[PDB]
Design an enzyme around this catalytic site. Structure first.
Site, PDB file in Angstrom:
ATOM      1  N   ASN A   1      -0.001   7.835  13.670  1.00 18.82           N
ATOM      2  CA  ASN A   1       0.299   9.070  12.953  1.00 18.82           C
ATOM      3  C   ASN A   1       0.148  10.285  13.862  1.00 18.82           C
ATOM      4  O   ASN A   1       0.904  11.256  13.746  1.00 18.82           O
ATOM      5  CB  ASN A   1      -0.597   9.204  11.722  1.00 18.82           C
ATOM      6  CG  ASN A   1       0.059   8.661  10.458  1.00 18.82           C
ATOM      7  OD1 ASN A   1       1.263   8.407  10.428  1.00 18.82           O
ATOM      8  ND2 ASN A   1      -0.735   8.493   9.405  1.00 18.82           N
TER       9      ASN A   1
ATOM     10  N   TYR B   1       4.034  14.057   4.318  1.00 20.63           N
ATOM     11  CA  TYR B   1       4.378  12.647   4.466  1.00 20.63           C
ATOM     12  C   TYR B   1       5.886  12.441   4.457  1.00 20.63           C
ATOM     13  O   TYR B   1       6.390  11.543   5.140  1.00 20.63           O
ATOM     14  CB  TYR B   1       3.716  11.813   3.368  1.00 20.63           C
ATOM     15  CG  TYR B   1       2.277  11.452   3.662  1.00 20.63           C
ATOM     16  CD1 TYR B   1       1.888  11.052   4.932  1.00 20.63           C
ATOM     17  CD2 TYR B   1       1.305  11.522   2.671  1.00 20.63           C
ATOM     18  CE1 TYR B   1       0.573  10.724   5.208  1.00 20.63           C
ATOM     19  CE2 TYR B   1      -0.013  11.199   2.936  1.00 20.63           C
ATOM     20  CZ  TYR B   1      -0.373  10.801   4.206  1.00 20.63           C
ATOM     21  OH  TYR B   1      -1.685  10.475   4.473  1.00 20.63           O
TER      22      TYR B   1
ATOM     23  N   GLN C   1       5.808   4.243   0.645  1.00 20.03           N
ATOM     24  CA  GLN C   1       6.479   5.504   0.937  1.00 20.03           C
ATOM     25  C   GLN C   1       7.389   5.375   2.154  1.00 20.03           C
ATOM     26  O   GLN C   1       8.499   5.920   2.168  1.00 20.03           O
ATOM     27  CB  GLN C   1       5.448   6.616   1.137  1.00 20.03           C
ATOM     28  CG  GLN C   1       4.790   7.073  -0.159  1.00 20.03           C
ATOM     29  CD  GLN C   1       3.817   8.223   0.039  1.00 20.03           C
ATOM     30  OE1 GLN C   1       3.550   8.985  -0.887  1.00 20.03           O
ATOM     31  NE2 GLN C   1       3.278   8.348   1.245  1.00 20.03           N
TER      32      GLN C   1
ATOM     33  N   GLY D   1       0.803  -1.203   0.000  1.00 18.91           N
ATOM     34  CA  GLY D   1       0.000   0.000   0.000  1.00 18.91           C
ATOM     35  C   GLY D   1       0.843   1.262   0.000  1.00 18.91           C
ATOM     36  O   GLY D   1       2.074   1.241   0.046  1.00 18.91           O
TER      37      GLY D   1
ATOM     38  N   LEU E   1      15.306 -12.223  13.600  1.00 16.24           N
ATOM     39  CA  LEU E   1      13.899 -11.921  13.847  1.00 16.24           C
ATOM     40  C   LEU E   1      13.321 -12.749  14.987  1.00 16.24           C
ATOM     41  O   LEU E   1      12.411 -12.293  15.687  1.00 16.24           O
ATOM     42  CB  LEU E   1      13.091 -12.150  12.570  1.00 16.24           C
ATOM     43  CG  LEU E   1      13.475 -11.294  11.364  1.00 16.24           C
ATOM     44  CD1 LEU E   1      12.795 -11.812  10.107  1.00 16.24           C
ATOM     45  CD2 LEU E   1      13.123  -9.832  11.611  1.00 16.24           C
TER      46      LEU E   1
ATOM     47  N   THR F   1      -5.690  -1.359   0.665  1.00 14.11           N
ATOM     48  CA  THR F   1      -4.607  -2.286   0.359  1.00 14.11           C
ATOM     49  C   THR F   1      -3.831  -2.650   1.618  1.00 14.11           C
ATOM     50  O   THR F   1      -3.621  -3.833   1.910  1.00 14.11           O
ATOM     51  CB  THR F   1      -3.669  -1.673  -0.680  1.00 14.11           C
ATOM     52  OG1 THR F   1      -4.404  -1.354  -1.868  1.00 14.11           O
ATOM     53  CG2 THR F   1      -2.546  -2.641  -1.019  1.00 14.11           C
TER      54      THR F   1
ATOM     55  N   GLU G   1      14.602 -13.351  17.774  1.00 14.60           N
ATOM     56  CA  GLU G   1      14.915 -12.748  19.064  1.00 14.60           C
ATOM     57  C   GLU G   1      13.970 -11.606  19.422  1.00 14.60           C
ATOM     58  O   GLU G   1      13.905 -11.218  20.593  1.00 14.60           O
ATOM     59  CB  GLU G   1      16.366 -12.263  19.070  1.00 14.60           C
ATOM     60  CG  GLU G   1      16.946 -12.038  20.457  1.00 14.60           C
ATOM     61  CD  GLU G   1      18.457 -12.177  20.481  1.00 14.60           C
ATOM     62  OE1 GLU G   1      19.037 -12.504  19.423  1.00 14.60           O
ATOM     63  OE2 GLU G   1      19.065 -11.964  21.553  1.00 14.60           O
TER      64      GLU G   1
HETATM   65  N1  LIG Z   1       2.862   7.887   8.401  1.00 11.82           N
HETATM   66  C1  LIG Z   1       2.396   7.772   7.159  1.00 11.82           C
HETATM   67  N2  LIG Z   1       1.072   7.443   6.962  1.00 11.82           N
HETATM   68  C2  LIG Z   1       0.583   7.321   5.705  1.00 11.82           C
HETATM   69  C3  LIG Z   1       1.401   7.523   4.604  1.00 11.82           C
HETATM   70  N3  LIG Z   1       0.656   7.338   3.497  1.00 11.82           N
HETATM   71  C4  LIG Z   1      -0.607   7.023   3.867  1.00 11.82           C
HETATM   72  N4  LIG Z   1      -0.666   7.021   5.232  1.00 11.82           N
HETATM   73  C5  LIG Z   1      -1.837   6.710   6.063  1.00 11.82           C
HETATM   74  O1  LIG Z   1      -2.483   5.578   5.521  1.00 11.82           O
HETATM   75  C6  LIG Z   1      -3.882   5.691   5.679  1.00 11.82           C
HETATM   76  C7  LIG Z   1      -4.556   5.490   4.329  1.00 11.82           C
HETATM   77  O2  LIG Z   1      -4.143   4.254   3.806  1.00 11.82           O
HETATM   78  P1  LIG Z   1      -3.234   4.128   2.484  1.00 11.82           P
HETATM   79  O3  LIG Z   1      -1.888   3.515   2.808  1.00 11.82           O
HETATM   80  O4  LIG Z   1      -3.075   5.468   1.812  1.00 11.82           O
HETATM   81  O5  LIG Z   1      -4.149   3.155   1.575  1.00 11.82           O
HETATM   82  P2  LIG Z   1      -3.550   1.962   0.674  1.00 11.82           P
HETATM   83  O6  LIG Z   1      -2.750   0.974   1.483  1.00 11.82           O
HETATM   84  O7  LIG Z   1      -2.715   2.557  -0.435  1.00 11.82           O
HETATM   85  O8  LIG Z   1      -4.853   1.197   0.112  1.00 11.82           O
HETATM   86  P3  LIG Z   1      -5.879   1.867  -0.937  1.00 11.82           P
HETATM   87  O9  LIG Z   1      -7.177   2.217  -0.237  1.00 11.82           O
HETATM   88  O10 LIG Z   1      -6.145   0.850  -2.020  1.00 11.82           O
HETATM   89  O11 LIG Z   1      -5.247   3.114  -1.512  1.00 11.82           O
HETATM   90  C8  LIG Z   1      -4.168   7.074   6.222  1.00 11.82           C
HETATM   91  O12 LIG Z   1      -4.459   6.946   7.593  1.00 11.82           O
HETATM   92  C9  LIG Z   1      -2.869   7.822   6.022  1.00 11.82           C
HETATM   93  O13 LIG Z   1      -2.667   8.772   7.038  1.00 11.82           O
HETATM   94  C10 LIG Z   1       2.736   7.853   4.788  1.00 11.82           C
HETATM   95  O14 LIG Z   1       3.466   8.033   3.810  1.00 11.82           O
HETATM   96  N5  LIG Z   1       3.227   7.979   6.074  1.00 11.82           N
END
Ligand SMILES: Nc1nc2c(ncn2[C@@H]2O[C@H](COP(=O)(O)OP(=O)(O)OP(=O)(O)O)[C@@H](O)[C@H]2O)c(=O)[nH]1
Ligand SMILES: Nc1ncnc2c1ncn2[C@@H]1O[C@H](COP(=O)(O)OP(=O)(O)CP(=O)(O)O)[C@@H](O)[C@H]1O
Ligand SMILES: Nc1nc2c(ncn2[C@@H]2O[C@H](COP(=O)(O)OP(=O)(O)O)[C@@H](O)[C@H]2O)c(=O)[nH]1
Ligand SMILES: CCOC(=O)c1cn[nH]c1
Ligand SMILES: [Ca+2]
Ligand SMILES: [Ca+2]
Ligand SMILES: [Ca+2]
Ligand SMILES: [Mg+2]
Ligand SMILES: [Mg+2]
Ligand SMILES: [Mg+2]
Lengths: 438, 425, 54, 352
Positions: A206, A224, A15, A10, A252, A145, A254
């Site tokens: 977060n 982000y 990221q 996801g 892992l 995801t 441990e």
């Molecule tokens: N800390 C942090 N949180 C993130 C980041 N990107 C998304 N989130 C968090 O992830 C959550 C949303 O889920 P996503 O990861 O964007 O969704 P996905 O896994 O891509 O699944 P989809 O719905 O298909 O897009 C929200 O609560 C966001 O704040 C990131 O780069 N860093």
């Protein structure tokens, strides 16, 4: 030397994975083209860093990582970013339309069609490992995801790699950085189906990373990139023992032994310090005692909660930089006489300490200032149950009205799986109270 | 490459859709010929969402123009941006629909529908990954109302797992063309309850009152009402047409805005709404106070009469995003009696740097409020005022309809009102 | 306040301090869940097409 | 515009604070389940602290210190005084107490009897009082057999402490009493003492040769108004306020309330609250806490003050609700949520 394969699922996982491997490269002295000058064994070797990097004949050091997203916009940055040369195309997997924040969609509808493709790409990295330890799975709780497809990948990894340990880095949903109303549903669905397939999971809220970015880094509205650069420092501090010479958390396995005496209670609390703004002209370097005393302040925790009203089941201090055992025990003593550290009677009242003399690495031009010593404390406290309580409560508010449930049923999920997952969280909360409260 | 296929049907449908392409085409730098001439790459970032790229770097809107009479689309074809449309995408008849829903849904319209779906199918086949469809139309006429809903039914049959959104102009006796508009609106609303994921309700009276009272237009014209709709349509599609930390497709938006399949009727809103004191700079508080003010909302429903299920707000312009969060959190935490407390964090905000043409900063409001039931109540009352006497029914029975179908439409919407009422307590 | 198991290497060291002494679903079963939900989607979609055919 | 919620409808105190809050025209009461709130007048038992301080943009404040139960529970306080070094086991202002669990369930049974046998052998006064928090159920006796057997008949933890055989008796009347001080602690952990205290006096003449009749020994406002036949004779409602009691101590003992009793009360309040500050301080927490306390004291014939118990949800003297409730809004609520003297409190400065 045993290998570790990292899986990023996801947007959040990918990221964050990007931020971690960027850091790993700056820590191991690997250049964006994959070349590593200090590596005197060309195209081979069983060094500590080789647990995360394989080597090609051309001296390239390739991460043992997989990136999976049901939409290509986030992984396309990897293919064209600074470290594009590190990965090969097979490592980056992308769909054409995501899960729309719908757990049922990522786990059932879409997940069923792409699960065998991911496993195949993972088997390729496994076939390059002479002794794979397990997997590190990064994902979000709220994403369709990150929640829906991750829980499916875990179920299959438990089947195709039975004797392999699995750890998680999971992003807890916070309103300040999300526009998703149904993330509580996803978080509880994914924790339910993943609970028995994960040996240890590091929840990052977060909301915690957000406040640390504004309070310490003086960032009015963090992005982000700000959040992930900080998260990758904690992840780096937690994975260092696997990538460097050492004797604590060397595999892992441990992590479960040192942090999880009870299987279902496998969510340690992470606390990091110091986090200093780079824009500060110069900062007064904190001592071993000060940064260790900060490990018990709620502010620098990865999940906002009050450990003073919980019981510890384990505690691990991972120092980086100019630190010697003498100072550690001196600060520990000073803190036992000033803090509230209540342990569970069926666990020793001790601390495992790991020191790595190489201080934390800072991404050039990032936000964190270069410090001479920092520490990450891993502690398994019942206090982290507060986070399950908050989340479970939001779930109850919407499920009482069946709000947004039709979107999940519409994708092949049964309504009963909601209450079935909720009753599991109720069981999980009851476990914490049996071990924490008197 | 998450493409959207646009469809505009009927007089109102095409004159509103026309202005919509005029507005966004200016925002993306596309001139009346289809050639790009802006100055920022953000204008092309998500350009393929609404436009196709032809030879010579030409950008052709992904729009299908539909009508049962030639008149209106002849105007579009000769309008400002008339040349920008794809010639093959003009599908029209000659008989007209005579403001009769039955003519658009069952007779006249049934004769032309297949040829429309041939153009839709042709546009979809060229889509890398189709997000979904959007339809502009009115509910009070015959083509956009009757044939428009027939199109959605046939589009859902062939694309069952694609999102169907609509911008639907609701009829109002104050800005009325015929007495049968309640009949036509009641028949369409049941189609939308079944076959649309999101429906933005635009009440021609709200548009009129805004032009008269707020914009200070002595005598508003349909063109004037359509300026508001164009700007609103640009506002709500900003999340889709430009980059940002949003990353939301039609299905992701529907999932977070629609807690119940049938209650997917939204109230849109825009700000500023300034009369010509028009060069005055607007602050974030003013943008926020106005965006939530009822006088800036186009459904002609007082939100203080119901409760918000979910609320989305889009801010455009270079402004203090920190100051944005402070003000939104001020409106909520100052009036939390109007938001349902059983949907945590049901107010989401999004920011965009590119402001609308000729505005330092704007705010678009998308609300899923149980107050919308008042809209359906008005329509239902006017429907029953006539149907109880069977007035004007011969126009419809002569096209093959039966009275039983009017009774059902009646019951269907009175049920829709009951559903909105139970979620308000 | 005792230190136990002290390991030293060029890159760091690690030890243990004690303050006070103490006092799965097979692959077949996953296919059935995935397909079962795919069958409920197929059924739901059938009732829609049956609705639209009516 | 500030918003608060009410989750303890039985709170006579905060019922007046909620009444005053709305009176300012600047506070808005919400439903008891609306998370978007600034202030929470929460419930007594099982207050969900973990859900506080997580709403973006909201600075939230609650009227209970999480962990203060360690001080307001009978058995907890005993364990806190004996195990805490700040107070030590030799704390001179707390009656020798023991935690005794019913045998049908650590426990201090043998340790209690050790001191008992020592007193019985030394001809000294060996009268104890058994009690618990689940009581309205109190028994005063001089035989250890009767004290232990009474707790075994119950099913909850109990505490046996030395009964004060030499209490200071007011005259005329020759009657026992107790002193109630209200102490407010704000989010900054300042300790404010309400200038107005109440002596809940026994309208019956104290009698040391009959602990069976618990009407002259128990100064509870409900026992005097229920089982006492002289209720309301000497003072209205068996309640003597500081103004009168101070004048009595001058005419009778040639001393003042401040010197003879009040200095000890302030010292006890400080010692107890400072002791637990590291455990309950909301200084670096994501939300803020404040709490009202009711300290019950005893005074003996030597003008030495003893600590009976601490109340976490104390009531108030009917003649002091207005002045006090308003005081809670000045220093506890408006200090964190300002609005568009001569304080009625006494700040007990200390080191944090
Ligand atoms: N800390 C942090 N949180 C993130 C980041 N990107 C998304 N989130 C968090 O992830 C959550 C949303 O889920 P996503 O990861 O964007 O969704 P996905 O896994 O891509 O699944 P989809 O719905 O298909 O897009 C929200 O609560 C966001 O704040 C990131 O780069 N860093
Ligand atoms: N060790 C002791 N010596 C002398 N008197 C005692 C005593 N323990 C209790 N008392 C008497 O009991 C009364 C307080 O009882 P206690 O506070 O333990 O019960 P309680 O908490 O239900 C009443 P409240 O909470 O309202 O003060 C005092 O008035 C005091 O006179
Ligand atoms: N806002 C707006 N409403 C219109 C316009 N033209 C017609 N309407 C409204 O739409 C209804 C008539 O429908 P119309 O589009 O003319 O019928 P059709 O062409 O057969 O579908 C009436 O309620 C009119 O008030 C327009 O240009 N703008
Ligand atoms: C808004 C402008 O409306 C008209 O011009 C009109 C409406 N009915 N008849 C004429
Ligand atoms: Ca090598
Ligand atoms: Ca397993
Ligand atoms: Ca014909
Ligand atoms: Mg995504
Ligand atoms: Mg017309
Ligand atoms: Mg009591």
């Amino acid at each position: 030397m045993r290998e570790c394969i990292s899986i990023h699922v996801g947007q959040a996982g990918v990221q964050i994975g990007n931020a971690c491997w960027e850091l790993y490269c700056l820590e191991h002295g690997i250049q964006p083209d994959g070349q590593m000058p200090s590596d005197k064994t060309i195209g081979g070797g069983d060094d500590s860093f080789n647990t995360f990097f394989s080597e090609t004949g051309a001296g390239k050091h390739v991460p043992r990582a997989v990136f999976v997203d049901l939409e290509p916009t986030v992984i396309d940055e990897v293919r064209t970013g600074t470290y594009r040369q590190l990965f090969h195309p097979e490592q980056l997997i992308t769909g054409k339309e995501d899960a729309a924040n719908n757990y049922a969609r990522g786990h059932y509808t879409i997940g069923k069609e792409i699960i065998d493709l991911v496993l195949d790409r993972i088997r390729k990295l496994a076939d390059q490992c002479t002794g794979l330890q397990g997997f590190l799975v990064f994902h979000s709780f709220g994403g369709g995801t990150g929640s829906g497809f991750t829980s499916l990948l875990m179920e299959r990894l438990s089947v195709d790699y039975g004797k392999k340990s699995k750890l998680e880095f999971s992003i807890y949903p916070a309103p300040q950085v999300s526009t998703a109303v149904v993330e509580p549903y996803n978080s509880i669905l994914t924790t339910h189906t993943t609970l028995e397939h994960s040996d240890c999971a590091f929840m990052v809220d977060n909301e915690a990373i957000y406040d640390i970015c504004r309070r310490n880094l003086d960032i009015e509205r963090p992005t982000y990139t700000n959040l992930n650069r900080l998260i990758s420092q904690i992840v780096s501090s937690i994975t260092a023992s696997l990538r460097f010479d050492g004797a604590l958390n060397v595999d892992l396995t441990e992590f479960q032994t040192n942090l999880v005496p009870y299987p279902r209670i496998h969510f340690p609390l992470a606390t990091y310090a110091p986090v200093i703004s780079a824009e500060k002209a110069y900062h007064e370097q904190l001592s071993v005692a000060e940064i260790t005393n900060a490990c018990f302040e709620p502010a620098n925790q990865m999940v906002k909660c009050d450990p003073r009203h919980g019981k510890y089941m384990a505690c691990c201090l991972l120092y980086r930089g100019d630190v010697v055992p003498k100072d550690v025990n001196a600060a520990i003593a000073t803190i036992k006489t000033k803090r509230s550290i209540q342990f569970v009677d069926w666990c020793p009242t001790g601390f495992k300490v790991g020191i790595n003399y190489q201080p934390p690495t800072v991404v050039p031009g990032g936000d964190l200032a270069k410090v001479q010593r920092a520490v990450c404390m891993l502690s398994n406290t019942t206090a982290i149950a507060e986070a399950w309580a908050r989340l479970d409560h939001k779930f109850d508010l919407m499920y009482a009205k069946r709000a947004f449930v039709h979107w999940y049923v519409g994708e092949g999920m049964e309504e009963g799986e909601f209450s079935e997952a909720r009753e599991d969280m109720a069981a999980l909360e009851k476990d914490y109270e049996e071990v924490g409260v008197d | 490459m998450r493409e959207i296929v646009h469809i505009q049907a009927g007089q109102c449908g095409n004159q509103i859709g026309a202005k919509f392409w005029e507005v966004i085409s200016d925002e993306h730098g596309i001139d009346p010929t289809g050639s790009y001439h802006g100055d920022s790459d953000l204008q092309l970032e998500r350009i393929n969402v609404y436009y196709n790229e032809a030879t010579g770097n030409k950008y052709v809107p992904r729009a299908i123009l539909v009508d049962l009479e030639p008149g209106t689309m002849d105007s579009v074809r000769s309008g400002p941006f008339g040349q920008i449309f794809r010639p093959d995408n003009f599908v029209f008849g000659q008989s007209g629909a005579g403001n009769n829903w039955a003519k658009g849904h069952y007779t006249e319209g049934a004769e032309l529908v297949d040829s429309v779906l041939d153009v839709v199918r042709k546009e979809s086949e060229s889509c890398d990954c189709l997000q979904g469809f959007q339809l502009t139309h009115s509910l009070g006429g015959g083509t956009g109302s009757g044939m428009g809903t027939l199109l959605i039914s046939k589009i859902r049959e062939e694309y069952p797992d694609r999102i169907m959104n609509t911008f639907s102009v609701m009829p109002s006796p104050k800005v009325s063309d015929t007495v049968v508009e309640p009949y036509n609106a009641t028949l369409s609303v049941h189609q939308l309850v079944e076959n649309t994921d999101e429906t933005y309700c635009i009440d021609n009276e709200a548009l009129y009152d805004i032009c008269f009272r707020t914009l200070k237009l002595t005598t508003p014209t349909y063109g004037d009402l359509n300026h508001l709709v164009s700007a609103t349509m640009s506002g709500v599609t900003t999340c889709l047409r430009f980059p940002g930390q949003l990353n939301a497709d039609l299905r992701k938006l529907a999932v977070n805005m629609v807690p119940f399949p049938r209650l997917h009727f939204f109230m849109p809103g825009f700000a500023p709404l300034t009369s010509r004191q028009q060069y005055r700079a607007l602050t974030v508080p003013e943008l926020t106070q106005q965006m939530f003010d009822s006088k800036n909302m186009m459904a002609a429903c007082d939100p203080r009469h119901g409760r918000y299920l979910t609320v989305a707000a889009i801010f455009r312009g270079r402004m203090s995003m920190k100051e944005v969060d402070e003000q939104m959190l001020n409106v909520q935490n100052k009036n939390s009696s109007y938001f349902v407390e059983w949907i945590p964090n049901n107010v989401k905000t999004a920011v965009c740097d590119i402001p609308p043409r000729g505005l330092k900063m704007s705010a678009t409001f998308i609300g899923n409020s149980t107050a919308i039931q008042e809209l359906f109540k008005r329509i239902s009352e006017q429907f029953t005022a006539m149907f109880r006497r069977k007035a004007f029914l011969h126009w419809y029975t002569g096209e093959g309809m039966d009275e039983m179908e009017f009774t059902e439409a009646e019951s269907n919407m009175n049920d829709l009102v009951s559903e909105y009422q139970q979620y308000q307590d | 306040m005792e230190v136990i198991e002290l390991n030293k290497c060029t890159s760091g060291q690690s030890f243990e301090v004690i303050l006070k002494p103490p006092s799965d679903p097979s692959l077949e079963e996953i296919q059935k869940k995935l397909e079962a939900a795919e069958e409920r989607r197929k059924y739901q979609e059938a009732e829609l097409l049956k609705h639209l055919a009516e | 515009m500030y918003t608060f919620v009410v989750r303890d409808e039985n709170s006579s105190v905060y019922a007046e604070v909620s009444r005053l809050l709305l009176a300012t025209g600047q506070w808005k009461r919400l439903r008891k389940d609306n998370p978007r709130f600034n202030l929470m007048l929460g419930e007594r038992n099982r207050l969900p602290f973990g859900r506080l301080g997580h709403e973006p943009g909201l600075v939230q404040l609650v009227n209970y210190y999480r962990g203060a139960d360690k001080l307001c529970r009978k058995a907890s306080l005993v364990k806190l005084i004996k195990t805490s070094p700040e107070l030590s086991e030799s704390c001179t202002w707390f009656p020798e107490s023991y935690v005794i669990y019913p045998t049908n369930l650590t426990d201090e049974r043998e340790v209690f009897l050790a001191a008992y046998n020592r007193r019985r052998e030394g001809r000294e006064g060996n009268v104890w009082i058994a009690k618990s928090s689940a009581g309205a159920g109190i028994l005063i006796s001089s035989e250890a057999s009767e004290l232990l057997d009474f707790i075994d008949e119950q099913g909850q933890v109990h505490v046996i402490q030395k009964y004060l055989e030499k209490p200071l008796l007011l005259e005329p009347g020759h009657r026992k009493f107790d002193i109630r001080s209200w102490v407010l602690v704000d989010h900054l952990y300042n300790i404010y003492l309400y200038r107005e205290g109440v002596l809940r006096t026994s309208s019956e003449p104290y009698n040391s040769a009959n602990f069976q009749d618990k009407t002259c020994h128990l100064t509870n406002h409900c026992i005097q108004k229920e089982y006492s036949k002289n209720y309301g004779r000497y003072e209205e409602g068996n309640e003597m306020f500081f103004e009168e009691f101070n004048q009595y101590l001058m005419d009778a003992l040639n001393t003042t309330l401040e010197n003879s009793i009040l200095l000890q009360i302030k010292h006890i309040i400080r010692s107890c609250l400072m002791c637990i500050e590291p455990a309950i301080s909301t200084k670096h927490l994501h939300y803020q806490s404040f709490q009202l306390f009711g300290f019950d004291f005893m005074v003996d014939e030597e003008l030495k003050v003893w600590l009976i118990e601490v109340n976490g949800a104390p009531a108030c003297a009917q003649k002091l609700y207005a002045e006090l409730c308003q005081g809670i809004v000045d220093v506890a609520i408006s200090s964190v949520f300002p609005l568009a003297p001569t304080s009625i409190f006494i700040k007990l400065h200390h080191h944090h």
